[PDB]
Design a protein around this ligand. Structure first.
Ligand SMILES: [Mg+2]
Ligand SMILES: [Mg+2]
Ligand SMILES: [Mg+2]
Ligand SMILES: [Mg+2]
Ligand SMILES: [Mg+2]
Lengths: 137, 40, 161, 182, 350, 48, 49, 183, 58, 133
RNA sequence: GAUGGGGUAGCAGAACGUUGAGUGAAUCUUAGAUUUUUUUUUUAUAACUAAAUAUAGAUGAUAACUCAAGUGAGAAUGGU
């Protein structure tokens, strides 16, 4: 007799079959008064239009935020955010910072430990002393 | 604290203590601790 | 060690000698049976259908038995008439004509006696109580070990052990 | 759901090193047990702790409504003939609770207070040192037995959730290498 | 007021409507991003992708909601996943087959798929919310999608007196996963086990309606490609869905059915007998062929584990990892169809 | 064109219309401080 | 104290304490909901400004 | 990471190995010809082989933090093989921090009080890492003076044939041949 | 396979699939000149309420 | 092109017929043992790639199954397998500070390092049919 | 497919921060300015995101550029 377990579900592998960019929204805040936003205002007029036209899967929201530095706040599918203050940055520095939020995921930064990350079982199995030619001391 | 002359506030809390314990009075929650518009 | 790079070298384990005898002048396919337990997806040839073309001699060919642990023997020593005798006796006096007494009398297994007849509901409740009274005599240390033994069994049949 | 009273005593003429030991004594005990231990203690502050503990029990009953289910408790169990609740504190002490409204000392800590006074210690060679006369306060958190029952049921569920012990555990291999070693 | 003019112009009757108007979908930046995030064909307008986000609990009209779109998509998802399991694992027991389907096209995975797309929900539905948000009211469970199951005349006793329900009938009466059929407002409250089921249900209907939208606009092949890209692409270990009862009897019944020699357990290896953590490696043979093997810290457990692995090997037989599906013949220009392997059925034992 | 405030965010998600009825039901201010006046206990005593 | 009382009433609900029956506050000697004669009569001498 | 995803139960299990201090060892002996001159493993050469088993360094999953070692049952430790005059001229020392309390004993005198098992324990003990796993690993060394020991049922087997027995290699090969009849 | 991207100096480079080989880069001062879908392109798609997949395809 | 050996043309179908397969790809000479569906986090920022780009990997030293293992002398012939990856994005580590200091010298020089890493997803790993070659 | 990379005494260049000042009768703030905390992100002696607590309309805070210094402390048997 075989009883079925109904607590296990399938897991998604973003990239296999279909790809989905993790960055889903980009909040672009500026200031018409703060001098630290002179570069941000230029990024919104010179480079943001073409950058947004090339990333139609991201939602761009340009809203003023007077009395505050300019920030680039990205929202990710995992539910986290990443805000980068771009005060006193030139337009091309803003673009390089915006491409960082696009290419990035919401996951927290982690030190480099292992290149490969796998969930499927070993093709050759795991070693066992009871499945070889034995060992004589 | 053992030698503080018990004031009138202390004598009033000891009388109520005997009423709640004896069963003469049924304890109820406060109603004048704060004047909230929610009343919850 | 002082750095992660040095720690990686002190804990290094070389690859299997099979992968060390690399080829030269061209590619090569070698037979590398690993010392590991195989998955259930490596279906034995006996479980493959007769149509499945993948059936084929062992890879070794393309290039006594161990001790007995459990070999039971089924027996049928009870007749349709003796089954009725087991039923009337079990219901007449379930205390005297226990399943062990009927098992030894008719040369059967204690299970088969329970497949032919069941004691009255009254005799069954006292059995569950007797096992519950002896359970309350267990301390916290023995009651926890008993529960662990009942969970390992369930986990085993779920593939978790 | 759970009643609680935080009571801070007055300033007692003693030090922290002295009063800390009387606080740790009544910690975890019932108010009745703590009062009996203060009545028969050889310490001088035990008389003050007993007075302050009776004051705290009065505010707990009048202001918070604690310890007001003893009559209804006895009828629930003695008439019914049911078995009271058996729990085990965090220290491991076994208890059999018949009244879930019984007040007990849940938390207790001592705090340093203002300096009572200064005494000059005149020593040899014309040297003078200032001795400080200390004051300290004790804070007791009174709760009902419902809290010890809930906290016990949580520790039991946590132990039952950690799974059983298995003979052959699947311990992980932590080092990754770009080849097969077997 | 004068200092805070509205950001998105809306008529005064906006809040009165249950869902935003269709034309409003043409001014939402969330929709346009969602449409491109899924690489949907331009044949699917934004007004249609907006209709896939309105649950029947937010708009009771047969239109403007997910009801019909989700039903068509559910039939496509369930069909493509069913034929795919019977061609990859033709020996799966019926119970394991129901769980495998529910593991791919059930409310749990579809909830994860909808979240994998970056679809946020609206707090409370209304004509003022962004059309790019999933709209539904978790307080109203009186909405149910049409299915192909029937209500059992003994359902009242099934739930109360624990009456028995067989597996052979779940294919005709119960739903596609074996589940029986038919199993002012104040927001000062917390969640509930019912609101979670209502929310999980809303996300599922959305993923289904997206598939139904692709089918209505693009066609059949486009729908199959979408299902095959976001659903069948997921990973599931079916071996972990097996729970055996007396596996030693089921294996003996299997060998008896196929006319194999009676199974005999043999000790292939052992160490640590008379210790605290021994290792008994038992292998079950039918004659000279090794069927299964299991290693445990007890002789009985090692014998049961060996029989379970022998039964899994029988049930988890797979002709191939990417087998042909009968749906491939509908696509014109396909090679002739080769008959697939049809199993007799799971073993029924004492 | 202007700053996006918490009120606007609630309006986008639809929660604002639910917040108005509650605050109004409890006679609490919606977008304001009301008609209560500033603290005066220290002012009446002569605080500077 | 009113900041501590409003929060306590919001969290406890049916267990809201009866503060009107508590002892006086030794910091000032006043009962619950009671002012001081100096503060109710405003007998404090203020600056000529 | 694929190579480590699976069941590590049998890799971390404790295997019970066996070795006799009297049986010639063509690998650990220094004399390799003629066949009649091959000796058993000398005291230290045997101890170096055991310390490797107790540490688990023969395993491809070895890690020094994890105690993945195995057991080693040693028999016939009364015939412990030694070269030169170690048996009568080697000395073991001992001190307890008290001046004058230096205890000395020769190998032959130590084998008279605690047998050859203690001579082998000291040799293996010094070959193990000096850390908090040294006492556990050394405890898994099971040294006995004769052929009798309480672990004749724990020794690893393959088809009922204990490793080191006459025909244990044929039992192993017979099991692997029957293991290739599968996909 | 290179996805659509924006080069600061050149312009917007459309998706190119070198497997079937076409890196066309469009620059301009209007959205229509960049080679992307605009709000107008979405409005004409929505007004084409008559286009229908062929019955055979369905 | 150099024809495949008969020993490889005979056993490759047996290699591709087994359930699972792994491969050891080489990116800039460094090996990575991966399988279909695995995620690779390279210790460097690959220039000229954005999330969504598809790469064709063509330097594999080992392509094997449980029992069989195909070995190439420098590498395996590209005609025998098809491995493809997709760029998932770019990750970063937390800023770490290395303090360079000598004894009896107060100057503590700081070094701030925050490196970026490109992440790939192996979405295809199949063995081709060589009955035609 | 540029070249270069340890550092005391010491020499040199480029910046950050603190306090006050000018633009400033400026800018922003119950649709929450400011809150010694916590948290998040960004090559980062710094700022930023968010959270919690309290509640100000200016004797509040503030970008940018510039001006001037009682301007940066684990080390003086240093002082309080
Ligand atoms: Mg004198
Ligand atoms: Mg150098
Ligand atoms: Mg230098
Ligand atoms: Mg703060
Ligand atoms: Mg100093």
């Amino acid at each position: 007799t075989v009883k079925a377990l109904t607590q296990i579900s399938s897991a998604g592998r973003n990239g296999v079959g279909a790809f989905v960019l993790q960055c889903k929204k980009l909040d672009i805040h500026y200031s018409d008064w703060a001098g630290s936003s002179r570069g941000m205002n230029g990024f919104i007029k010179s480079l943001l239009p073409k950058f947004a036209a090339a990333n139609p899967q991201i939602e761009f929201v340009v809203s003023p935020r007077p009395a505050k530095h300019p920030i680039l706040m990205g929202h990710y599918i995992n539910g986290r955010t990443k805000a980068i203050c771009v005060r006193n940055m030139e337009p091309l520095e803003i673009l390089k910072k915006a491409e960082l939020l696009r290419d990035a995921s919401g996951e927290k930064p982690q030190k480099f430990k292992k290149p490969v990350t796998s969930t499927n079982p070993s093709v050759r199995g795991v070693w066992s002393p009871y499945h070889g030619q034995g060992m004589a001391v | 604290p053992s030698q503080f002359e018990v004031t009138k506030d202390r004598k009033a809390i000891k009388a109520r203590q005997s009423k709640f314990l004896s069963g003469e009075e049924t304890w109820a929650p406060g109603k004048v601790n704060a004047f909230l518009n929610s009343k919850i | 060690q002082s750095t992660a790079n040095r720690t990686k070298r002190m804990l290094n384990i070389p690859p299997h000698e099979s992968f060390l005898n690399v080829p030269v002048e061209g590619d090569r396919i070698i037979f590398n049976p690993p010392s590991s337990e195989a998955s259930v997806y490596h279906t034995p040839f006996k479980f493959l259908p007769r149509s499945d073309p993948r059936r084929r001699a062992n890879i070794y060919k393309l290039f006594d038995l161990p001790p007995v642990l459990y070999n039971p023997t089924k027996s049928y020593n009870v007749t349709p008439e003796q089954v009725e005798e087991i039923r009337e006796l079990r219901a007449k006096d379930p205390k005297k004509y226990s399943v062990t007494y009927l098992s030894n009398k008719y040369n059967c297994t204690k299970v088969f006696i329970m497949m032919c007849t069941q004691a009255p509901r009254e005799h069954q409740e006292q059995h569950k109580l007797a096992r519950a009274r002896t359970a309350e005599n267990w301390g916290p240390r023995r009651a926890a070990a008993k529960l662990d033994a009942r969970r390992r069994k369930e986990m085993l049949h779920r593939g978790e052990i | 759901t759970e009643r609680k009273l935080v009571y801070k005593t007055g300033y007692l003429p003693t030090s922290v090193k002295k009063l800390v030991h009387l606080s740790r004594q009544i910690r975890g005990k019932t108010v009745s047990e703590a009062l009996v231990q203060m009545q028969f203690s050889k310490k001088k502050m035990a008389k003050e702790v007993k007075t302050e503990l009776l004051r705290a029990e009065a505010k707990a009953i009048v202001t918070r409504g604690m310890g007001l289910g003893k009559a209804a408790a006895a009828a629930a169990q003695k008439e019914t003939g049911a078995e009271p609740v058996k729990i085990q504190t965090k220290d491991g002490k076994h208890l059999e609770i018949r009244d879930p409204t019984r007040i007990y000392v849940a938390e207790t800590f001592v705090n340093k207070g203002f300096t009572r006074g200064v005494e000059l210690d005149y020593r040899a060679r014309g040297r003078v040192f200032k001795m400080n006369k200390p004051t300290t306060t004790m804070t007791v958190v009174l709760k009902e037995e419902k809290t010890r029952i809930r906290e016990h049921q949580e520790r039991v569920a946590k132990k039952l959730r950690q799974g059983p012990w298995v003979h052959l555990p699947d311990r992980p291999v932590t080092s990754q290498r770009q080849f097969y070693s077997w | 007021n004068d200092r805070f003019p509205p950001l998105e112009p809306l008529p005064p009757a906006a809040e009165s409507l249950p869902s935003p108007l269709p034309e409003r979908a043409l001014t939402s930046a969330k929709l346009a991003a969602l449409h491109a995030r899924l690489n949907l064909s331009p044949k699917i307008p934004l007004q249609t992708l907006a209709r896939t986000l309105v649950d029947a609990s937010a708009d009771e009209n047969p239109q403007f909601n997910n009801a019909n779109l989700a039903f068509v998509g559910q039939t496509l998802i369930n069909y493509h996943i069913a034929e795919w399991l019977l061609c990859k694992y033709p020996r799966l027991p019926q119970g394991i087959l129901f769980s495998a389907m529910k593991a791919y096209a059930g409310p749990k995975p579809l909830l994860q798929i909808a979240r994998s797309w970056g679809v946020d929900t609206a707090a409370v539905p209304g004509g003022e919310v962004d059309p790019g948000l999933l709209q539904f009211d978790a307080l109203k469970p009186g909405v149910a999608i049409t299915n192909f199951g029937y209500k059992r005349t003994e359902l009242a006793y099934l739930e109360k007196f624990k009456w028995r329900r067989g597996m052979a009938s779940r294919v005709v009466l119960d739903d596609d996963f074996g589940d029986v059929v038919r199993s002012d407002v104040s927001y000062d409250r917390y969640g509930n086990p019912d609101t979670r089921a209502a929310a999980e249900r809303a996300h599922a209907y959305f993923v289904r309606a997206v598939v139904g939208a692709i089918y209505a606009h693009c066609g059949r092949e486009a729908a199959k490609a979408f299902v095959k890209a976001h659903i069948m692409s997921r990973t599931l270990d079916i071996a972990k869905l097996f729970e055996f009862k007396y596996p030693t009897r089921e294996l003996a019944a299997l060998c008896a059915r196929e006319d194999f020699e009676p199974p005999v357990a043999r000790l292939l290896s052992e160490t640590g007998r008379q210790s605290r953590t021994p290792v008994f490696v038992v292998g079950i043979y039918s004659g000279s062929d090794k069927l299964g093997e299991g290693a445990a810290s007890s002789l009985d457990h090692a014998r049961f584990k060996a029989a379970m692995n022998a039964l899994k090997a029988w049930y988890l037989y797979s002709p191939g990892e990417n087998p042909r599906v009968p749906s491939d013949m509908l696509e014109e220009g396909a090679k002739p169809w080769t008959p697939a392997y049809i199993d007799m059925g799971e073993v029924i034992s004492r | 064109p202007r700053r996006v405030t918490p009120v606007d965010k609630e309006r986008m998600v639809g929660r604002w219309k639910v917040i108005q009825k509650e605050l109004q039901k409890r006679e609490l201010p919606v977008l304001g401080t009301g008609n209560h006046g500033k603290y005066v206990e220290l002012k009446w005593l002569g605080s500077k | 104290a009113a900041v501590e009382a409003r929060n306590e009433d919001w969290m406890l609900g049916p267990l809201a304490p009866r503060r009107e029956l508590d002892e006086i506050t030794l910091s000032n000697g006043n009962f619950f909901g009671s002012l001081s004669p100096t503060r109710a009569l405003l007998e404090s001498e203020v600056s000529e400004e | 990471m694929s190579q480590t995803v699976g069941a590590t139960r049998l890799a971390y299990s404790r295997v019970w190995h066996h070795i006799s201090a009297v049986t010639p060892h063509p690998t650990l002996s220094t004399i390799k010809a003629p066949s009649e001159a091959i000796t058993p493993p000398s005291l230290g050469r045997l101890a170096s082989r055991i310390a490797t088993i107790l540490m688990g360094k023969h395993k491809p999953i070895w890690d020094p933090s994890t105690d993945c070692g195995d057991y080693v049952v040693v028999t016939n430790c009364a015939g412990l093989y030694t070269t030169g005059h170690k048996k009568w001229r080697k000395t073991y020392y001992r001190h307890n921090t008290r001046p004058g309390s230096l205890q000395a004993i020769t190998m032959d005198a130590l084998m008279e009080k605690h047998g050859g098992a203690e001579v082998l324990r000291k040799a293996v003990s010094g070959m193990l890492p000096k850390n908090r796993l040294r006492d556990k690993r050394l405890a898994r060394l099971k040294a006995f003076e004769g052929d009798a020991h309480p672990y004749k049922e724990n020794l690893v087997r393959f088809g009922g044939k204990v490793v080191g027995a006459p025909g244990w290699e044929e039992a192993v090969k017979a099991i692997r041949e029957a293991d290739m009849e599968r996909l | 396979k290179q996805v659509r991207r924006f080069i600061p100096g050149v312009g917007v480079q459309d998706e190119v699939d070198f497997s079937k080989v076409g890196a066309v880069v469009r620059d301009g001062k209007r959205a229509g000149d960049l080679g992307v879908r605009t709000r107008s392109d979405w409005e004409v798609i929505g007004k084409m309420k008559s286009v229908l997949p062929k019955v055979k395809a369905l | 092109q150099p024809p495949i050996s008969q020993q490889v043309k005979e056993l490759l179908p047996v290699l591709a017929a087994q359930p699972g397969h792994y491969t050891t790809i080489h990116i800039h000479g460094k090996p990575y043992l991966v399988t279909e569906g695995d995620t690779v986090k390279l210790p460097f920022k690959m220039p000229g790639v954005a999330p969504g780009d598809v790469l064709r990997l063509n330097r594999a030293s080992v392509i094997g199954s449980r029992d069989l293992t195909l070995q190439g002398a420098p590498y395996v012939d590209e005609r025998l397998f098809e491995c493809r990856a997709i760029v998932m994005g770019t990750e970063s580590e937390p800023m770490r500070v290395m303090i360079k200091k000598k004894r009896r010298c107060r100057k503590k020089k700081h070094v701030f390092s925050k490196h970026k890493y490109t992440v790939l997803r192996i979405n295809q790993l199949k063995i081709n049919d060589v009955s035609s070659l």
